[PDB]
Amino acid sequence: TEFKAGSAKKGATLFKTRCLQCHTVEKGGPHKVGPNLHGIFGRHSGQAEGYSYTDANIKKNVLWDENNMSEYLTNPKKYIPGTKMAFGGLKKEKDRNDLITYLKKACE
């Protein structure tokens, strides 16, 4: 790709410190501020039921792959202008590789 595997353990702690405030990853996990992300890989943006997405996310219709996800995480608002996800971004590719490695695994 333009994405390579990292440390899932490192990625777990990245999740906890940077994403857990708003999201769950487990199957049967609830929506919070943000939507539960189980099964995100391969699904298009805006399709978790019971969550109120912005117009912007839905119409962006991103197919979530480890690769798209990387560009998204760099700068969410640059990627989906108008998203209400209030997260600045993960500028280091190594951080993103770690986190996505952990998401790839925990969201299946």
Added chain:
Amino acid sequence: TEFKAGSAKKGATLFKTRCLQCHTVEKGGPHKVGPNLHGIFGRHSGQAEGYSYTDANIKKNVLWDENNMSEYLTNPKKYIPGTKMAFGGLKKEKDRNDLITYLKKACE
């Protein structure tokens, strides 16, 4: 995406006339000229076991999503220079949408 759903039925007949000569889609289907494609979506290129891929496909490490797949099908050799897949391409987006619609479904 930059890909929209079409006719899975139309996509089935596209498969039969243009891809079936070399590939199977069913779970438990054999490799032929080309590899069995069950589960292709979300997997990287070159990872079906028991198939002898070209150096080119493997190192290209494409993550197969309905979207990548479209660009691939336009012109396989332009996309993976050196691939031994001898298929010229499906130039009409509508044809590709139909076929991918059918693959999305039959390869799960």
